């Protein structure tokens, strides 16, 4: 599924993403356009061979299984498939443990380079929430 913006900065306030860790809600929109375009199915392979799924980018490295990510972890106890589909409660009960982990959103290299220290309310502007 492609969310729209504002369909999106509304699934992620319903699942009580909205301030999560300190999070304002455009954060994580922002996060999720530069990640994945809003496309639940996105998925990328990283250098070390590990591969991120769904709107979050989600590193089979640590927080999913995949079954071909050797000396990987599953902390989010799911199969990496889950974080694909077009119900993101998967992706973003995950991300709450990921921005749990101490690193807060940095764990999102994109948010780091793309979204830390800007207007990230633009992200949620116009939309009904
Ligand atoms: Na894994």
């Given at each position: 599924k492609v969310f729209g913006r504002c369909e999106l900065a509304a699934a992620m306030k319903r699942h009580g993403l909205d301030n999560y860790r300190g999070y304002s809600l455009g954060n994580w929109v922002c996060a999720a356009k530069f990640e994945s375009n809003f496309?639940?199915?996105?998925?990328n392979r990283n250098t070390?061979?590990?591969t991120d799924y769904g709107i979050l980018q989600i590193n089979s490295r640590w927080w999913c299984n995949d079954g071909r990510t050797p000396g990987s972890r599953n902390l989010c106890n799911i199969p990496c498939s889950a974080l694909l589909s077009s119900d993101i409660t998967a992706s973003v009960n995950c991300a709450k443990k990921i921005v749990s982990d101490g690193n807060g959103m940095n764990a999102w290299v994109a948010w780091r380079n793309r979204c830390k220290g800007t207007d990230?309310?633009?992200?949620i502007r116009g939309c009904r929430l």
């Open positions: 496309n639940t199915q996105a998925t070390d061979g590990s990230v309310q633009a992200w």
